[PDB]
Amino acid sequence: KRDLLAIQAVRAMDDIDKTINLFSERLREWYSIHFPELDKLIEDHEEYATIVSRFGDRGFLTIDSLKELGFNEQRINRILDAAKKSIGADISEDDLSAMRMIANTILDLYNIRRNLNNYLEGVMKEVAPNVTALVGPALGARLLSIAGSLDELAKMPASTIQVLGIIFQYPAIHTSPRWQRGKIARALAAKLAIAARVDAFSGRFIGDQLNEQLKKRIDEIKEKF
Amino acid sequence: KRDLLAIQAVRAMDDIDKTINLFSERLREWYSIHFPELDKLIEDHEEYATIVSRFGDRGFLTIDSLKELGFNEQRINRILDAAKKSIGADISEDDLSAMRMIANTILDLYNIRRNLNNYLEGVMKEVAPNVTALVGPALGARLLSIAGSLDELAKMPASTIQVLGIIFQYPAIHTSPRWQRGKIARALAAKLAIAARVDAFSGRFIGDQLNEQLKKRIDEIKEKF
Numbered sequence: 001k002r003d004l005l006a007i008q009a010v011r012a013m014d015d016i017d018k019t020i021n022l023f024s025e026r027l028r029e030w031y032s033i034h035f036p037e038l039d040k041l042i043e044d045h046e047e048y049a050t051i052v053s054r055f056g057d058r059g060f061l062t063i064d065s066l067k068e069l070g071f072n073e074q075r076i077n078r079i080l081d082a083a084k085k086s087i088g089a090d091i092s093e094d095d096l097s098a099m100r101m102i103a104n105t106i107l108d109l110y111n112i113r114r115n116l117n118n119y120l121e122g123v124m125k126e127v128a129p130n131v132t133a134l135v136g137p138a139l140g141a142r143l144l145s146i147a148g149s150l151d152e153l154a155k156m157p158a159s160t161i162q163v164l165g166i167i168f169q170y171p172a173i174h175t176s177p178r179w180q181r182g183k184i185a186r187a188l189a190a191k192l193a194i195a196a197r198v199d200a201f202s203g204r205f206i207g208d209q210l211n212e213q214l215k216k217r218i219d220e221i222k223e224k225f
Numbered sequence: 226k227r228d229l230l231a232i233q234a235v236r237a238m239d240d241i242d243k244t245i246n247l248f249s250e251r252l253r254e255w256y257s258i259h260f261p262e263l264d265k266l267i268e269d270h271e272e273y274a275t276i277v278s279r280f281g282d283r284g285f286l287t288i289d290s291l292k293e294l295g296f297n298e299q300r301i302n303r304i305l306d307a308a309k310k311s312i313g314a315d316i317s318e319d320d321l322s323a324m325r326m327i328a329n330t331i332l333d334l335y336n337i338r339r340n341l342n343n344y345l346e347g348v349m350k351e352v353a354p355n356v357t358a359l360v361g362p363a364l365g366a367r368l369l370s371i372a373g374s375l376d377e378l379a380k381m382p383a384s385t386i387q388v389l390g391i392i393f394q395y396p397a398i399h400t401s402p403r404w405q406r407g408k409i410a411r412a413l414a415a416k417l418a419i420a421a422r423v424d425a426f427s428g429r430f431i432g433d434q435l436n437e438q439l440k441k442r443i444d445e446i447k448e449k450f
Binding site for chain 2: 022026030089102
């Protein structure tokens, strides 16, 4: 039942994301009593957690310490200055380390995502290689997730897969001007229909040819203005 | 701003719970493809995670290894037999360890809740000891959370505190027959109103006397049938 397990993986990854956001709200609100300005200075949750985590108190931040995170000099100065002039409150090391329990959890969740993503790839490359050849591990598991199972996906016509539409995230689609996407999504759906079927029956790998045929048809679609 | 930080802690605890549940739904569904029966055999999420976590594959479970978790022999038999007769599928060690990332995260969350709870008690015992004397750390931060701040709580009359009603969770209340609760909640509200105020002003500790006066009035309420 190897396809089921890949779905569970992708579903776990979504649950990690919901969570990362939940804990990041919390961390941002929480740590913000101490350093209110950092919040709007950093959009990315992983970075915010990293600061609260490795450095802690606004007064322990440094040029060197921050270059150690790939922040450019233009931004290093905004942070470090808003560290000095800071409107926020003072914090005991017990307050810091309690905030950090949440911060480090967020960091832990980021690694688990990466890890589950590698698990997702190994599996999908074995249970549905021709689907993965087309849309990649994640999207491929995601279709299965909505489909219910590989067998259930392989029983869908192209017209059904096209709406699950979610395949509209495929770069060749998402890149294209809105008018072209109808016809492109139709070509992908068509290849996915075959791809899910040779995979279901566990036949020979036609990923190369499936991709070439998609590129040809997309070019013809595109060279028709 | 030490009261705010206590609130953030309690709010973080709730977020942990929402999460524990989310991850355990997922883990139960996921690991269930392997051991479908374990699900209804164990209601507690911490235990389920512990099995998936330390043991893994249904077939590695044992009497001794299960006594190592405080399960009674009446229960150990149900599990270990539903291990043999198991309707579930087979799994690679890659599938197990991927499930486990979720399982261990759940275990990690349980620790953080305990730790945050210890943080919560140290703090509340300093910032609002008289409130904590009354209702305890958790409930006390929870009122603050609803109130917004210690100052804002200390501005509420008894009649407003009584509805935030959440104080109805206090044992002497929740224990009592529905009819008595009105008058008991009234007495607690009254003592909390004073307790929040000596706390706000940061006055002298009247926790002992406040508790004695509540026990007296509760007795009188009770010995009135």
